[PDB]
Amino acid sequence: METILEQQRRYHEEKERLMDVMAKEMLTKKSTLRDQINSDHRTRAMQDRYMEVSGNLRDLYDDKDGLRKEELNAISGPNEFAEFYNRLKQIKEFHRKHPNEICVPMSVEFEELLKARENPSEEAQNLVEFTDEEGYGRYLDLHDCYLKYINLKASEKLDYITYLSIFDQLFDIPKERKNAEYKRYLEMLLEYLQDYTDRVKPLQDQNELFGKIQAEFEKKWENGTFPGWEERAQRLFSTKGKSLESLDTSLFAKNPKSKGTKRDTERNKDIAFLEAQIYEYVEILGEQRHLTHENVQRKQARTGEEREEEEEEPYWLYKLHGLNINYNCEICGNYTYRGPKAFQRHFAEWRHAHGMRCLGIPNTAHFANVTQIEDAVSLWAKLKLQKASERWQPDTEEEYEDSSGNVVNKKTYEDLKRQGLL
Amino acid sequence: SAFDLDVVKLTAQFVARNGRQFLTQLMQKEQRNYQFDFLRPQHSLFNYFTKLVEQYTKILIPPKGLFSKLKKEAENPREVLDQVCYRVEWAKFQERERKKEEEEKEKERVAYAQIDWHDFVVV
Amino acid sequence: QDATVYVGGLDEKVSEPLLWELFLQAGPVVNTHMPKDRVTGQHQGYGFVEFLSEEDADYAIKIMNMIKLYGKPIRVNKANIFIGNLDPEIDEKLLYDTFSAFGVILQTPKIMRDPDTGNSKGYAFINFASFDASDAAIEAMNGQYLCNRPITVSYAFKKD
Ligand SMILES: [Zn+2]
């Protein structure tokens, strides 16, 4: 197999087709947010497929460095080419043209008029990744988080506006203790906010953003990211102040700070990372949180009907010529025909021939004035028997006397004679 | 049409490894009693065979995957998005140039259908 | 329709038994049909020959194609620019190849057909890429010698 010649060119053609499909998707205008989110998800899937194809093609270079000495040699050539042509010299009886060598990846990376989705992305749906209250990235669902916060706080003195004001803080004082059970709800709220940020922009590099967030949490947040003018340096895990930078560096490797506490850097590192991720998601998606707060305020200020509307978004010839007397035929869909002059003519017309073909019986003068099915099939059996009888069938009707005994056995049919003479 | 396409792909793979324009693995095969009608430029399949030979020559580039590894197209979606935006801008510029050429052709047709064809002067 | 062959380009010398006698050497032509006009009461140049087998109709279409019968381009077939008095022996691909010498064609051309026979009506419509190809067709092709039929190219719509 030509893995360096044919497979690399096929991977390059697939990458060029994916880039052309991405350019055609980016050049087309958008009219709705859900269709734009679906197009962005399809472009992200096509970019992931192109990255996988490039990673598969980039690993096919180990044998190429060994085969380049034999491929670039001018002493070789038409011997192996003539051997491959003799291998390609098989029977050409498969008379079938295949124009889908390059047209099939072009049609697989395209959409239809009824549904604007690609062929690998035909099973993708925007309702399986986002809820109806989010609006495909327009707002964020915070009713379940507010219910969980009200269940954890064990008090009914916190509304949705108070929860939105408590969630709007980034570096202020927290509402509850850092070593309490609110961190288990904050980690779930951060894991939901990370999925909401990854769903609001599928075309952005999530792995590079996660690596940048991890680098900012390790190199900056773990080394005093909030300087002061106890107020000079504050620790997120130990929740205590520091006199100077040397005292904080000496206390960073201390025994209560490493593992000798309940909020040290060994056990409470994941909660601090989740809090940093929640702060980064609140700083990156503050406009979506403000839009969700404005939508919640508009839903609270509205009435019941406004909220329902927001959630819903020659009579003599008649009897002289034969009319008023109707006849029906089962062979013709129980089609009821009018006066006899038309009824007698219908057997020759198209509809009756069609109805008769359904059973497989030809239209002849024998099957006239016959309107029922079973009568037709019985008369067809009769006519078949009659005609088949009255013909001359030489196969069963013939008297051969084979030369096996040559003076006996004249009861041989026309088939046993061939079997004896074979 | 699979056998002819396979023969054209084999000819494009054997002709791309040549060290000269006329000293290839297909010019000597024509004198070796092997019938190959796709080598002549008069056939319509020669335009596809030239594109296949160009793709085989572009598959032998040093950034094509022989002695180097691509990092921008394989490990950066933002570079691919910028390349797609540049391709869309180039397609929009080509469409604008085609519209300007069509407008110039319409202006030339309007000017040619309004000139006087009776003022003949033979010098 | 498969066993019948539609003949186009018949003059006044050709008749209904004459086409069956001329098509008798190609195959067993069972019947001949000639639609009469309403204003003149004669044949419009297009007729049909219903044979017994489809192979005889194929041989008559491959043998009597673009023939000069009664001083007319008779041809048998399987039953903004305007071109008139065109020969029925040419097809859409043949008209596209003949129109490719003057200018570039935007798409595949279409030829008008009769509602009864459906082989050839007599007029066709073709669209060019620009007005220069239309002017070259009105200068050169409007009056060129086609296959035994003087065609006439004209503009379909023009604004003064
Ligand atoms: Zn009936």
Q: Subunits that touch chain C (at least 3 Cβ pairs < 8 angstroms)?
A: B
Distance from CA of B112 to the nearest CA of C (A): 10
Distance, CA of A273 to CA of A390 (rounded, Å):
99
- Nearest residue to A36 (alpha-carbon basis) of A106, A135, A139: A135
Phi, psi of C126 (to 5 degrees): -135, 145
- For chain A, how many residues are written? 422
Distance from CA of B102 to the nearest CA of C (A): 8
A385 CA to centre of ligand 1 in angstroms: 24
Distance, CA of A197 to CA of A178 (rounded, Å):
25
Name the one residue in this structure whose structure tokens are 């296959």. C147
- Contact call for A54 and B70, based on CB within 8 A: yes
Q: Are C20 and C32 in contact (CB under 8 A)?
A: yes
Distance from CA of B108 to the nearest CA of C (A): 9
Other CB atoms within a 10 A radius of the CB of residue A48 amount to 13
Distance from CA of A45 to the nearest CA of B (A): 11
- Contact call for A26 and B81, based on CB within 8 A: yes
Distance, CA of B81 to CA of A39 (rounded, Å):
13
Helix, coil or strand: residue C51: strand
Which neighbouring-strand residues pair with C81? C126, C155
Distance, CA of B25 to CA of A80 (rounded, Å):
10
A381 CA to centre of ligand 1 in angstroms: 19
End-to-end CA distance of chain A: 52
CATH architecture of C81-155: 2-Layer Sandwich (3.30)
Phi, psi of C74 (to 5 degrees): -80, 135
- Chain B residue nearest residue A89, CA to CA: B3
- Nearest residue to A137 (alpha-carbon basis) of A189, A194, A191, A200: A200
Distance, CA of A390 to CA of A413 (rounded, Å):
19
A346 CA to centre of ligand 1 in angstroms: 6
Whether there are 3 or more C-beta pairs closer than 8 Å between B and A is: yes
DSSP state of A272: H
Whether there are 3 or more C-beta pairs closer than 8 Å between C and A is: no
- Angle formed at CA A364 by CA A363 and CA A369, multiple of 5 degrees: 90
A347 CA to centre of ligand 1 in angstroms: 6
Q: Subunits that touch chain A (at least 3 Cβ pairs < 8 angstroms)?
A: B
Helix, coil or strand: residue A215: helix
Calculate Rg over the CA atoms of chain A: 43
**Residues A165-182, buried b or exposed e (16+ Cβ, 10 A)?**
eebeeeeeeeeeebeeeb
Contacting residues for A161 by C-beta, under 8 A, at least 6 apart: A296, A297, A300
CB-nearest partner of B3 from A54, A57, A88: A88
Q: What is the largest CA-CA distance in chain A?
A: 135
With contacts defined as CB-CB under 8 Å, which chain B residues touch A85?
7, 10, 34
A116 CA to centre of ligand 1 in angstroms: 49
Q: Does A47 touch chain B (CB under 8 A)?
A: yes
Q: Does B48 touch chain A (CB under 8 A)?
A: no
CB-nearest partner of A5 from B56, B88, B91: B56
Distance, CA of C111 to CA of C95 (rounded, Å):
9
- Contact call for B59 and A9, based on CB within 8 A: yes
The residues on C that touch B, with CB distances below 8 Å, are 130-132, 135
Q: Are B13 and B52 in contact (CB under 8 A)?
A: no
Distance from CA of B109 to the nearest CA of C (A): 6
Q: Does B50 touch chain A (CB under 8 A)?
A: no
- For chain B, how many residues are written? 123
- Contact call for C132 and B105, based on CB within 8 A: yes
- Chain C residue nearest residue B107, CA to CA: C131
Distance, CA of B9 to CA of C95 (rounded, Å):
34
Distance, CA of A218 to CA of A273 (rounded, Å):
9
Residue ranges of the alpha helices (H) in C23-157?
A: 54-63, 92-99, 131-136
Looking only at the bridges linking them, the beta strands covering C110-111 and C123-126 are antiparallel
Cβ under 8 Å to B: A residues 86-115: 88, 92, 94, 97-99, 101
- Contact call for A19 and B9, based on CB within 8 A: no
Q: Angle at which helices B46-58 and B2-15 pack, to 10 degrees?
A: 50
- Chain B residue nearest residue C134, CA to CA: B109
CB-nearest partner of A9 from B1, B55, B92: B55
